[PDB]
Design a protein around this ligand. Structure first.
Ligand SMILES: Nc1nc2c(ncn2[C@@H]2O[C@H](CO)[C@@H](OP(=O)(O)O)[C@H]2O)c(=O)[nH]1
Ligand SMILES: [Ca+2]
Length: 104
């Protein structure tokens, strides 16, 4: 069973932890990857009720199992905060335009 389901993409807690770790490291070092500069601030315009405090940062999680290193980020993201706490897993899949919905 999937711990997080984003559309047809299936993720386990291990997938999420691995992606989060890579993203948080880049954030700590003040570096970015990709044309859209990840990780970067996630403003939460959607208004999700996260259990952890802001600021939030978004980092792509890939269905391939690889850690994001550039190119297309796909539709899925892991959102973490300043204390490397997981806020949640979100996706563009099933959402209008460039909005997000939570992965179930
Ligand atoms: N939908 C949405 N996009 C946000 C939010 N905060 C920042 N963004 C950015 O606005 C764009 C929405 O797809 C993305 O930028 P990017 O295209 O540079 O990756 C996304 O990172 C937010 O809370 N909601
Ligand atoms: Ca996996």
């Amino acid at each position: 069973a999937c711990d997080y389901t984003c559309g047809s993409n299936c993720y386990s807690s291990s997938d999420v932890s691995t992606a989060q770790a890579a993203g948080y490291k880049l954030h700590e070092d003040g570096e970015t990857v990709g044309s859209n500069s990840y990780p970067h601030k996630y403003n939460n315009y959607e208004g999700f009720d996260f259990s952890v405090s802001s600021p939030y940062y978004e980092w792509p999680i890939l269905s391939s199992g690889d850690v994001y290193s550039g190119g297309s980020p796909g539709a899925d993201r892991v959102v973490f905060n300043e204390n490397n706490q997981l806020a949640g897993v979100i996706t563009h899949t099933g959402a209008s335009g460039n909005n997000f919905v939570e992965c179930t």
